[PDB]
Design an enzyme around this catalytic site. Structure first.
Site, short mmCIF file in Angstrom:
data_model
loop_
_atom_site.label_atom_id
_atom_site.label_comp_id
_atom_site.label_asym_id
_atom_site.label_seq_id
_atom_site.Cartn_x
_atom_site.Cartn_y
_atom_site.Cartn_z
N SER A 341 0.78 -1.21 -0.04
CA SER A 341 -0.01 0.06 0.04
C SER A 341 1.03 1.30 0.11
O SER A 341 1.49 1.40 1.04
CB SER A 341 -1.10 0.10 1.32
OG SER A 341 -1.69 1.24 1.24
N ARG A 342 0.80 1.95 -1.06
CA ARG A 342 1.72 3.01 -1.36
C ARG A 342 1.30 4.30 -0.38
O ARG A 342 2.40 4.91 0.25
CB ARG A 342 1.58 3.36 -2.85
CG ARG A 342 1.84 2.28 -3.95
CD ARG A 342 1.95 2.60 -5.22
N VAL A 343 0.05 4.59 -0.42
CA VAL A 343 -0.24 5.62 0.49
C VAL A 343 -0.16 5.39 1.81
O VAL A 343 -0.07 6.08 2.73
CB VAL A 343 -1.98 6.04 0.35
CG2 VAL A 343 -2.66 5.09 0.96
#
Ligand SMILES: Nc1ncnc2c1ncn2[C@@H]1O[C@H](COP(=O)(O)OP(=O)(O)O)[C@@H](O)[C@H]1O
Lengths: 477, 470, 56, 475, 464
Positions: A341-343
């Protein structure tokens, strides 16, 4: 008048090329004399390709085709909440019509660059595996990709069911899915009471492609309402792989030049212009949110497949669900390795932020290590220690079904094992430990988990450290 | 309401109705032409409208198109293909056109014959709570429970007793559940078909089931419709009579295969791997018709031939998306004399969750598998270290494991013919209890061959003192 | 013995590296031939799908 | 309404105006005298498949109807006569005097017109009649790489049909004409043309001929079938037929997986289907099909091969991966027979059964045999005869073995009677124990024939008679 | 005619009733002005497009042509001068002398380059092996008199040189009528070969037909027919013939070049939907009959080293003997680089080559394969964990795979080694001893690049 209607040349496979309609807008609803609706896509010189939304048999040549002058819009309102409707908004749940005042067009532009605010506010999935390792904030987009029968649906469901205390008005878009399942699913929501905040938009595998195609966008529309109000929406597009396919059919029928893997050239534009419509509105706009959960069904788990790849690059990270994990009886079937999960992390709350940092580590090594046990008959080094709590974390990451977990008493168990307060307990007893360590808290730490709520922090570290022993020192074995 | 043939492309015909009539899509068009000279051939050929191309229609001929001459008139029956339904179809074998292909006579003009093309039940018509279908077959009801109103996969076909299973199934359901079965051959091997007929004649279960044969020798249209035909016959006993029926489709792959074949003659643009761009949708409107409405239900067993043991091909892929469980028949278990030859590990089921069976079934089920996995992996060692050393636990497992995978056989009703044993219908409840106890090891003293081909756990007891144990 | 064995395990510790290392190179040699065969394949599939459309 | 006018002539294919009366698949006739078949009946012209040289044709030429669906000469005149697909003899033995005439495309026996095949078709090749047994009216696809022994197997099989009542029909689709000669020659040497026809469409001939070859042969075969005789049809290289038909179809600009027509499956389906076992209500007739497929690289996942396989009842895959060890390269692993076991007689059934098990383990214990003795226990035991049995399944080219004595050697090893002898002495043991069966003892060498079933001597006889030659053999 | 459409090598000449298939149209035009160029071209009728039009395939650059020009039907296919005059001459695709020595007599018989293949009555059956002096071939894949030999090989594998060594080892000593047609092959070769023909002393008994890489598709399309008709003369009009066709691939290749412009539906890989048949109609023609014998050896290029490519693939079912060349073996230094397990011949029978020669034949192949399988282990674990029995097989195999190398006389100028023709009895024997283990002491390198087995012993001691 004379132009604004047309006559059907060709009928078959859900498609109708009509004459006339010299004034139809590309993307205008067109009604057939038989009452069945449709949509104009190809506006050519001599004709117009339409995609029939509904039964196409009751359509022959010569049938009249009269315009509407509306671009494919759909019902929107505070009355859909709790109702099951098709991509047209037409209630199929068989309880009355949906009485709504307002409406919104399916096709809509996404909040502008400025319009948004970097996601900070989380989405509590209630799933240890997710909101620890692959965290999801409101306004984000988390693609959950996986092979059929990996639990992809299950997740979305339990997630929704986890939205009661949170302020989230949920929308489950079912595309291509068996109307069978969608029913048994909309019900298990009925029982857990998800319908009080949850909208259901379905187009089953019996329904014509154009409906499948329209279902996702028809879904975001209804979401967008609560977003531009300042409320928070969560849209689960269940299986874009199918919708994206339904478009291929429809587009191929209009004999549009087909591309790689037969998908039209705009197949990428399709999803892109869709997913972006989910975000976090800037405080300047009421700070609303619409979080999107795109599914991608994978064959053999080929991540290298055309569609699955596009959406991977589109979303903010993804959750990859192993096919084998699922059978070996590990639920959820998450693959912590590829799942990212980048965010991430601005989504997590401090109380997680800490006890989550190390979680990836212990699990990391274990993934690169435990390929070796049977050869580990000589079990060596401290590499035995990494495995130690490693095989134990997995146990903690294993969760039940239809049983979400609140962050409060979640950070504590993701605390226990990561501090060793778990390590003295064999894997056999790890699952059936965290089970009463919850109750032990719901009675005796009910004060402790509070600080965890109201502050979303644990600066706690001291009390819990001893307060955790209060339990193991009374537990069975 | 009379048109004339304009184009004949292989199995595809282009009829033209001069004005205004235009047979609605899916309607069946007859062609009955009597040879008007020594330079022509008799024709009795039925067609199905596909698309309206200028007051022109294209069609897919269910039977051969040879002998057709441009201009022979075509006659719109006003309705799509309609086939007989009711007790009338029981024990009767028809073809795509719902025309009996047996010698037992022909269907009266009184008989109600519904259409083959209809939409699946409405969202408000389906079943709410998922309910399991008891088959009385230990292997199944325990490790791979059939969802009553779902689609079960049947893999592997060659000398595994596949037929007993299918047959036995038709038997058990119609016995304890009081329902019909409809066997549909869709384009696979006339030879196998002819045999199954005889076996269902012998098994005496053909009394309880209606058959349809679309075999691998018919043109695209036929193969493409048979599944619907045999289907429609099944829907009857559900909607009309409230029964839970079982619709068997042998090789549903031929359905989607035959599909693409034509799609090319129709003029549809090639899709992933040549497959008709309509693929997913065709398969949907076919499958969605199989479920449990308020009244009855239809559960289907499909046999899927994957395109060269490749599970990523559009055809299989698309099908699996409707499958609720998978029954694997292994050529190994039979050799070892474990009938049914269902692989206790490979056969999976969706309804194998505690949510749908509760713990005691689940707990037992997943356990019975695990213990079986041990006895599997150890096999290598057994062939290395003999039975001397396995951690003196691994033995205890290999003990129970055998008793267990042996007790996974059964006395088949359709086996009384060559064996004489009456046969058994062991319920899920009785089945769970048996392995429960065998897992608690309370049987560890009865010789292997005692649990081998029996009923409820008691039948192992009597089988035993029959060995001579107190 | 002790020095013999010390060698044994060692010689094996290594011979089991040489194989690992080498095996790892067998990947590179194949990764390459996989990509190439990954390419020609996705190129043939497409060429097939268009060439079958221009035929209509 | 009868006459027609050529509007395109090229590559053995032509489109002409007129012929408003032709039936789909009707045989027409051009001006210069050659025939052609009409496949497309298009609104504005007709696709004609020129059935011979397309040189002697020009634009505008008259293409006159016939009002006859394609069909070919079928009679007892064709026996040992090399004729093309149209029936015209190429062997030069004069014309074929036939009375009756059978249509090419004909409906296969119904689901009510068949019977379970119980009658074995003895191939004479141990490895096949033991492992993958073929029955009368079956379809056994033999698929393999260039020159793996495909052609030679079918031939040997035919040659082993002297005793049985079998009318062989060998077709060579796309094959080399010179080659089909040495084949039809090598057939006369052994006196196989006494029951066997030959349909040759050489690779030089026009595609539509190759395409029409197979249907042309079955027709000739269906003759004796529906009549009560048993037939055997060898489709040698269906691959080339498809390769042809593709051309045919691509010339007619038929919308094209892998350029093959959507119907390319139906091509072989409606063909091999026409082989079966007619119910005893119909005279118990049968036609067995032995289709061929040429695999590139051995890639069984290829389009054509999956098609022909999804069709035949079982198949025998021939690796060359081997005939460069076990000769008549027969991959015991992949090779299957669906019908199988219902084909073999009670003599084969009882012995050939465990023959699978023994071979099974050996294919499966063989990731083990390294350990050897280190301690492998009872499993070098199951290994022993395993490594012996392969020698048994080994047979030499052009040496058919009768069933009788065949089930005897496939007996000896399956009971231990071959183990007291080394693996490298087994082949010799066959030669040996068999002659001495032909002389020493003789009683069990045709019981297995008469009854064709069961003990072959109760137990003690065989068992001890096996003690006879063993005890008299060499080192 | 009147040419109204010019597409590359494919020209559309319009013609009532004139409608000339397979005929040759010559376009004889003279520059009317300074905006034009003299055109001398010959088109081969391909198909009838209808509306009294025909699509043609040029035999040279079509540059300069214009719509509305005048085309003449010679009223017959491409006719080529055939006869006892063709000996010691170089012709074109059309049968024109390119050797700058005179032209051909008007009396001379001119045959068409398009004939039907001999019937089933004509073609022969009989078997006769033929010695080439090549250890590999003779042992593993022997050639047959009057039989068809393919040489399959990719780029720079040694096809050419192998041919040269054959013509050297055979054509010279046969007593036969030689016909050498380089199709689509190199231009240098033509001059290398033509001027070595003069040295050697056969440019009497050999017929030279050329077209090379610089000629358009139509050309290479027929150069394989033109040369065939030549040999077909001496076979059906009079003796045995050696037909040397260099790269029959270029025929099919050029084929695809035109197939597109014909307006054909492309087949697999984009090849002409007729590829198969077009080769069937030009192969069987190259065959021996009851009249005369034709022993042909054709070079077969392998595109991108893919034997699954329609061109060489489809070619396989056209030969009685094959020699498949591998790039691997080539870089190993094994020349000729000939697959010892791929190359085949119908001759390998005990009923043809004798038992002794047979069993060794397979014996070699057996042990070469057994080594092949072992290779993954060697490549991973080295030879350390192999048995004392498999190791032996690794040595033999290698040394056998090395002895399969040969000194080709048409090599020397490069390497500097002289060359050798190894008799069949000596090859058969040489390998025997090696399989029989008289040489298990000698190092590998000793067996590399040699003739008769004795030489290995010689080159052995020279090592030390
Ligand atoms: N028998 C041989 N001995 C030594 N060198 C060779 C031999 N055969 C080929 N070569 C080398 O390999 C190269 C390829 O030659 P060539 O025969 O032209 O390949 P191809 O004709 O297949 O393109 C040449 O440059 C030559 O030096």
């Amino acid at each position: 008048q004379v132009s604004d209607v047309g006559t059907v040349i060709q009928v078959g496979d859900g498609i109708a090329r009509a004459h006339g309609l010299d004034n139809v807008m590309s993307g205008e609803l067109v009604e057939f004399a038989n009452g069945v609706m449709g949509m104009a896509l190809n506006l050519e010189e001599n004709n117009v390709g339409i995609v029939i939304l509904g039964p196409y048999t009751g359509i022959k040549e010569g049938d009249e085709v009269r315009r509407t002058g509306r671009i494919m819009e759909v019902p929107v309102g505070e009355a859909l909440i709790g109702r099951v409707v098709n991509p047209l908004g037409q209630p199929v749940d068989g309880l009355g019509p949906v009485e709504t005042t307002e409406t919104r067009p399916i096709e809509s532009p996404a909040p502008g660059v400025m319009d948004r605010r970097s996601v900070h506010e989380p989405l509590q999935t209630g799933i240890k595996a997710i909101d620890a390792l692959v965290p999801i904030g409101r306004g984000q987009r988390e693609l959950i990709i996986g092979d059929r029968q990996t639990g992809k649906t299950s997740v979305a469901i339990d997630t929704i069911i986890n939205q009661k205390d949170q302020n989230m008005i949920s929308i489950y878009v079912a595309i291509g899915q068996k109307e069978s399942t969608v029913r048994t699913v909309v019900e298990t929501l009925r029982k857990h009471g998800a319908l009080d905040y949850t909208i259901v938009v379905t187009a089953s595998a019996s329904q014509p492609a154009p409906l499948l195609f329209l279902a996702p966008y028809a879904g975001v529309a209804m979401g967008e309402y609560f977003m531009y109000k300042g409320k928070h929406v969560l849209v689960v597009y269940d299986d874009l792989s199918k919708q994206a396919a339904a478009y291929r059919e429809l587009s191929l029928l209009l004999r549009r030049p087909p591309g790689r893997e037969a998908y039209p050239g705009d197949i990428f534009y399709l999803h892109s212009r869709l997913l972006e419509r989910a975000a976090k509105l800037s405080d300047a706009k009421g700070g609303g949110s619409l979080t999107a959960l795109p599914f991608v069904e994978t064959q053999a788990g080929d991540i290298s497949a055309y569609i699955p790849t596009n959406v991977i690059s589109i979303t903010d990270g993804q959750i990859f669900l192993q096919s084998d994990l699922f059978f070996s009886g590990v639920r959820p079937a998450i693959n912590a390795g590829l799942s990212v999960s980048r965010v991430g992390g601005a989504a997590q709350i401090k109380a997680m932020k800490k006890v989550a940092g190390t979680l990836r580590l212990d699990l990391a090594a274990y993934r690169e290590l435990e390929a070796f046990a049977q050869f580990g008959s000589d079990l060596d080094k401290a590499t035995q220690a990494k495995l130690a709590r490693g095989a134990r974390t997995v146990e903690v990451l294993k969760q039940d079904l239809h049983q979400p977990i609140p962050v409060e008493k979640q950070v504590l168990i993701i605390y226990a094992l990561t501090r060793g307060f778990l390590d003295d307990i064999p894997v056999e007893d790890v699952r059936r430990f965290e089970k009463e360590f919850y109750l032990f808290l719901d009675q005796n730490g009910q004060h402790l988990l509070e600080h965890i709520r109201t502050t979303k922090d644990l600066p706690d570290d001291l009390n819990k450290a001893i307060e955790a022993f209060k339990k193991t020192f009374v537990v069975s074995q | 309401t009379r048109g004339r043939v304009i184009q004949v492309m292989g199995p595809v015909v282009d009829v033209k109705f001069e004005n205004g009539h235009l047979p609605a899509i899916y309607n069946a068009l007859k062609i009955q032409h009597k040879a008007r000279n020594e330079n022509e051939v008799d024709i009795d050929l039925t067609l199905e409208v596909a698309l309206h191309l200028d007051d022109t229609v294209r069609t897919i001929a269910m039977a051969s198109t040879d002998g057709l001459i441009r201009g022979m008139e075509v006659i719109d029956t006003g309705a799509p293909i309609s086939v007989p339904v009711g007790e009338v179809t029981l024990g009767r074998v028809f073809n795509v056109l719902g025309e009996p292909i047996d010698l037992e006579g022909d269907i009266p003009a009184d008989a109600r014959r519904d259409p083959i093309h209809r939409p699946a039940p409405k969202f408000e018509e389906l079943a709410t709570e998922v309910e399991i279908l008891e088959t009385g077959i230990k292997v199944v009801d325990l490790l791979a429970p059939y969802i009553k109103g779902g689609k079960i996969g049947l893999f592997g076909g060659a000398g595994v007793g596949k037929t007993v299973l299918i047959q036995e199934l038709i038997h058990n359901i119609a016995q304890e559940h009081g329902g019909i079965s409809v066997f549909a051959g869709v384009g696979e091997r006339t030879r196998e078909g002819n045999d199954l007929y005889h076996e269902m004649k012998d098994s005496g279960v053909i009394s309880k089931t209606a058959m349809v044969f679309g075999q691998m020798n018919e043109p695209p249209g036929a193969r493409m419709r048979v599944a619907l035909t045999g289907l429609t016959m099944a829907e009857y006993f559900r909607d009309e009579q409230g029964q839970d029926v079982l619709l068997f489709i042998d090789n549903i792959f031929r359905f989607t295969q035959a599909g693409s074949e034509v799609s090319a003659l129709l003029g549809r643009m090639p899709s992933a791997v040549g497959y008709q761009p309509t693929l997913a949708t065709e398969m949907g409107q076919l499958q969605e018709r199989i479920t449990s409405t308020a009244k009855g239900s239809i559960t289907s067993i499909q046999a899927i031939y994957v395109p060269a043991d490749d599970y990523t091909d559009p055809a299989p892929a698309t099908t699996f998306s409707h499958l609720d469980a998978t029954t694997n028949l292994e050529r190994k278990l039979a050799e070892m004399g474990i009938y049914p030859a269902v692989d206790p590990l490979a056969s999976t089921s969706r309804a194998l969750a505690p949510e749908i069976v509760g713990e005691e079934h689940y707990q037992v089920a997943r356990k019975v598998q695990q213990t079986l996995q041990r006895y599997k992996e150890l096999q290598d060692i057994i062939a290395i270290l003999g039975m001397d050393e396995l951690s003196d636990e691994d033995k205890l497992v290999v003990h129970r494991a055998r008793r267990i995978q042996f007790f996974l056989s059964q006395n088949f009703h359709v086996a009384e013919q060559f064996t004489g044993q009456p046969g058994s219908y062991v319920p899920v409840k009785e089945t769970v209890r048996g392995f429960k106890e065998i897992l608690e090891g309370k049987y560890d003293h009865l010789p292997e061959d005692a649990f081998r081909l029996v009923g409820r756990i008691e039948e192992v007891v009597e089988k035993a003192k029959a060995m001579g144990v107190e | 013995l002790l020095d013999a064995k010390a060698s044994e395990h060692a010689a094996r510790m290594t011979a089991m590296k040489n194989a690992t290392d080498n095996a790892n190179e067998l990947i590179r040699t194949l990764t390459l031939s996989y990509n190439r065969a990954r390419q020609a394949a996705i190129t043939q599939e497409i060429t097939e799908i268009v060439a079958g459309a221009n035929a209509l």
